[PDB]
Amino acid sequence: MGRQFGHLTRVRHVITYSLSPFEQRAFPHYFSKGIPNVLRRTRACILRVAPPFVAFYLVYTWGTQEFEKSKRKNPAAYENDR
């Protein structure tokens, strides 16, 4: 579509190395460094992700609590008596 490898950009003085997929393990150090990585990733975002959704649960735990209280009858039987 008028754009393909060959004219994308001008790259100079960059050397890359790579291995054959058959000469390297597909799952290298999965839990050795992947698990410590996810802890690093989660911390970097838990201060921007959790607080917005923590508030929603607070709305949930209060909006639903008040709704049942409305359906619950209140002791307003005075002024009629026997």
């Binding site: 490898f5 060959g6 004219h7 994308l8 790579s18 054959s20 997929p21 058959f22 000469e23």
Partner: protein, 49 residues
């Protein structure tokens, strides 16, 4: 030794070193178009199935 080579030998010998073997690729210059290694590796065999 040359007179003992035929089509069957060439087909067998080539398929032992070339077919479905991981190649080593070296590039230099404007090699943006140079296909990815998986594209290069998958070119060692035909019929893809």
């Amino acid at each position: 030794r040359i007179a003992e080579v035929d089509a069957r030998v060439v087909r067998e010998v080539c398929s032992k070193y070339f077919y479905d073997q991981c190649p080593a690729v070296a590039g230099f210059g404007p090699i943006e178009q140079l296909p990815d290694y998986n594209r290069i590796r998958s070119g060692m065999f035909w019929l893809r199935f």
